[PDB]
Design a protein around this motif. Structure first.
Motif, mmCIF file in Angstrom:
data_model
loop_
_atom_site.group_PDB
_atom_site.id
_atom_site.type_symbol
_atom_site.label_atom_id
_atom_site.label_comp_id
_atom_site.label_asym_id
_atom_site.label_seq_id
_atom_site.Cartn_x
_atom_site.Cartn_y
_atom_site.Cartn_z
ATOM 1 N N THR A 125 0.817 -1.213 0.000
ATOM 2 C CA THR A 125 0.000 0.000 0.000
ATOM 3 C C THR A 125 0.848 1.259 0.000
ATOM 4 N N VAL A 126 1.738 1.365 0.979
ATOM 5 C CA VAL A 126 2.744 2.407 0.961
ATOM 6 C C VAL A 126 3.174 2.632 -0.487
ATOM 7 N N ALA A 127 3.493 1.527 -1.154
ATOM 8 C CA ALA A 127 3.722 1.501 -2.594
ATOM 9 C C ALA A 127 2.618 2.211 -3.374
ATOM 10 N N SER A 128 1.426 1.631 -3.369
ATOM 11 C CA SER A 128 0.292 2.255 -4.024
ATOM 12 C C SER A 128 0.376 3.752 -3.785
ATOM 13 N N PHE A 129 0.262 4.133 -2.517
ATOM 14 C CA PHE A 129 0.278 5.527 -2.079
ATOM 15 C C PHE A 129 1.291 6.398 -2.826
ATOM 16 N N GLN A 130 2.531 5.928 -2.900
ATOM 17 C CA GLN A 130 3.570 6.602 -3.667
ATOM 18 C C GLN A 130 3.068 7.104 -5.021
ATOM 19 N N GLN A 131 2.445 6.216 -5.787
ATOM 20 C CA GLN A 131 2.045 6.532 -7.157
ATOM 21 C C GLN A 131 1.056 7.691 -7.188
ATOM 22 N N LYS A 174 13.476 1.752 -0.328
ATOM 23 C CA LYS A 174 13.225 2.013 -1.739
ATOM 24 C C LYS A 174 12.247 3.161 -1.960
ATOM 25 N N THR A 175 11.194 3.203 -1.146
ATOM 26 C CA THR A 175 10.116 4.179 -1.314
ATOM 27 C C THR A 175 10.498 5.547 -0.781
ATOM 28 N N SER A 179 13.346 -8.071 4.067
ATOM 29 C CA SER A 179 12.882 -7.768 2.705
ATOM 30 C C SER A 179 11.887 -6.598 2.582
ATOM 31 N N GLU A 180 10.972 -6.507 3.540
ATOM 32 C CA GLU A 180 9.925 -5.495 3.527
ATOM 33 C C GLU A 180 10.494 -4.140 3.895
ATOM 34 N N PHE A 181 11.378 -4.150 4.885
ATOM 35 C CA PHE A 181 12.072 -2.947 5.318
ATOM 36 C C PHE A 181 12.762 -2.298 4.115
ATOM 37 N N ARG A 182 13.171 -3.142 3.169
ATOM 38 C CA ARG A 182 13.846 -2.746 1.940
ATOM 39 C C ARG A 182 12.939 -1.874 1.096
ATOM 40 N N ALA A 213 13.179 6.645 -0.681
ATOM 41 C CA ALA A 213 13.912 7.024 -1.883
ATOM 42 C C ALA A 213 13.011 7.657 -2.941
ATOM 43 N N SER A 214 12.124 6.856 -3.515
ATOM 44 C CA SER A 214 11.176 7.368 -4.485
ATOM 45 C C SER A 214 10.728 8.743 -4.023
ATOM 46 N N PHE A 215 10.054 8.765 -2.876
ATOM 47 C CA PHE A 215 9.502 9.979 -2.279
ATOM 48 C C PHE A 215 10.415 11.200 -2.405
ATOM 49 N N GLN A 216 11.676 11.034 -2.023
ATOM 50 C CA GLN A 216 12.676 12.083 -2.184
ATOM 51 C C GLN A 216 12.577 12.785 -3.537
ATOM 52 N N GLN A 217 12.563 12.004 -4.610
ATOM 53 C CA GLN A 217 12.615 12.558 -5.963
ATOM 54 C C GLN A 217 11.413 13.452 -6.237
#
Lengths: 48, 48
Positions: free
Chosen positions: A42-48, B41-42, B34-37, B44-48
């Protein structure tokens, strides 16, 4: 036989408690892992 | 034989509990890592 019953108790205790431990752990963890996944997804989803 | 069963219990207990410990740990950790990863990653995304 007392020491035995004592073992029998210690064992019964250990057994039901084993059962308890075994269960709680399994329930707690398996479930926990899977749901945490959702969170991530979801965090994922949210990002988009 | 009682001491034995006591060991047998202590062992059974230790075994199922072993199983429990081994599992919970593996599940908890591998997954957790793995999930913490994802999180990272996100962020990260968010930063951009």
């Amino acid at each position: 036989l007392s020491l035995q019953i004592d073992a029998a108790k210690v064992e019964a205790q250990n057994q039901l408690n084993a059962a308890r431990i075994a269960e709680i752990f399994n329930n707690m963890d398996l479930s926990k892992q899977s749901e945490f996944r959702e969170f991530l997804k979801t965090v994922a989803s949210f990002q988009q």
